[PDB]
Structures are given as structure tokens and as C-alpha cells.
Design a protein around this ligand. Structure first.
Ligand SMILES: NC(=O)c1ccc(-c2nccc3c(-n4cnc(-c5ccccc5)c4)cccc23)cc1N[C@H]1CC[C@H](O)CC1
Length: 211
């Protein structure tokens, strides 16, 4: 049981600009995904202060970066608050619509793609490097879901039958064939050091064993 939704035309127009751009500083996608994870971890931590039971689904607060050269995927995993079905299909899109509208005008104006996160559409910077993004998430108040889009005008949402995650989010970047540098340990280390090492949670870059 998979539900397929259309994006509104202006969002669809932004995702196409992003997926098609030759903008050179594409490393900024990683800062944006890590920032979302950090926000998600803050959110559940600030919630846990009054209601301690909000961490029964996992005490550990961390971010893991998981390259897989075999599958050409970079996965960003966190144990933050996660997202509900209603977040994925409704609440997040309200912010995306408002953020999109504005950013598309600043782009006309001659603003830089790296300020995408200022307008709350930083998530879409994934398409700088990915042909498809799969978001698998578990919020305390809902079941485990997978959102996915290839920036083709639509996204799907389905119950995720896969491995239970407890609480948190995995963003799986199915990388563009010309963007495989983002699977190299040397490259990921460089970006995290430049853009993300002052994040307030441990970021663990996983190494791969022999194929
Ligand atoms: N790692 C993460 O938790 C995360 C990972 C990804 C995203 C994320 N941000 C923006 C848009 C998303 C999205 N989406 C993109 N467009 C739509 C959309 C657009 C129009 C209509 C309907 C949906 C949904 C799908 C999945 C994750 C998204 C957000 C995330 N975190 C937010 C911070 C914590 C709370 O504030 C809520 C979650």
C-alpha cells in the first residue's frame, strides 16, 4: 500500500532547478542534512526535559554517516524526534511551500544556492547530489514510514516493513553517477570538518570493509 502525491508546481519547479544545476559548491547538501538531524535531536532532547518517557525509544542521541559504494548510497542516520505520517504528507510541505516561493525569487535576484537553508528548504539540497532520496523515519507517536522522491513531480509514502529503527530518521541518498566523491572517506571528512564539526552530537563516519 503506497500513496503517491503530486508536488505543487512551484515546488516541482524548484526541485528541477536544484537537480539540474551545475552550481559548483554541492558539498553544502551534507551540512543541511546534518543540521536537520541536529534539530531533530534537539527537539527530542528539549521534549525529554519535561517528559522523560520520550526517550524510552532509545537513549542514544547521535548522527551516523554511512557510505555504501556497492549501492552508490550515502545514508545519514539520526536518533532524533523522527516524523509522523502527517509530518511527511502535510506539515513539512506547508513549510516547503512557503520556503520555495521565496527562494525562487532570490535565485532571480542572483542569490546563492547555499542560502537554501535560510528559507527552510535545505532538505531539497539533497538533489544537488542525489537522483532519489528515501527518508525512513519513526516518531514516538506513529508507525515507521518511508517517504521517497526522484524529483519527478511526485513523491510516495508507504508503511516501512523494513528493520525497526526505534526512533529517528535515515535519509538515503541514491547518488547521481557523477557525484560518487561523496562516498569517499577523505571527502566526507573534509566536508564535516569545514561545515559541521561544531554540531552538538557525535557524528560517526562509518568505514566500509572489503567488498
Ligand atoms: N533527520 C531529520 O529528522 C529530518 C530529515 C528530513 C527532513 C525533511 N525536511 C523537509 C522536507 C521533507 C520531506 N518533504 C519534502 N517535501 C515534502 C512535501 C512537499 C509538498 C507537500 C507535501 C510534502 C515533504 C520529506 C521527508 C523529510 C523532509 C526533516 C527532518 N527533521 C525535521 C526537524 C525535526 C522536526 O522539526 C521535524 C523534522
Amino acid at each position: 500500500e503506497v500513496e503517491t502525491f503530486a508536488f505543487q508546481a512551484e515546488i516541482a519547479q524548484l526541485m528541477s532547478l536544484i537537480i539540474n544545476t551545475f552550481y559548483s559548491n554541492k558539498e553544502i547538501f551534507l551540512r543541511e542534512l546534518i543540521s536537520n538531524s541536529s534539530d531533530a535531536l534537539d527537539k527530542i532532547r528539549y521534549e525529554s526535559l519535561t517528559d522523560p518517557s520520550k526517550l524510552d525509544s532509545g537513549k542514544e542521541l547521535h548522527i551516523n554517516l554511512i557510505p555504501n559504494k556497492q549501492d552508490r548510497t550515502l545514508t545519514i542516520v539520526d536518533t532524533g524526534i523522527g516524523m509522523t505520517k502527517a509530518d511527511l504528507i502535510n506539515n513539512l510541505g506547508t513549510i516547503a511551500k512557503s520556503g520555495t516561493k521565496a527562494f525562487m525569487e532570490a535565485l532571480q535576484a542572483g542569490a546563492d544556492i547555499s542560502m537554501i537553508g535560510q528559507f527552510g528548504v535545505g532538505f531539497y539540497s539533497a538533489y544537488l547530489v542525489a537522483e532519489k532520496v528515501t527518508v525512513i523515519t519513526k516518531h514516538n507517536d506513529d508507525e515507521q514510514y518511508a517517504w521517497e522522491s526522484s524529483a519527478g513531480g511526485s513523491f510516495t509514502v508507504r508503511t516501512d516493513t523494513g528493520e525497526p529503527m526505534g526512533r529517528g530518521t535515515k535519509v538515503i541518498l541514491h547518488l547521481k553517477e557523477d557525484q560518487t566523491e561523496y562516498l569517499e572517506e577523505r571527502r566526507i571528512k573534509e566536508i564535516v570538518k569545514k561545515h559541521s564539526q561544531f554540531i552538538g552530537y557525535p557524528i560517526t563516519l562509518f568505514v566500509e570493509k572489503e567488498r
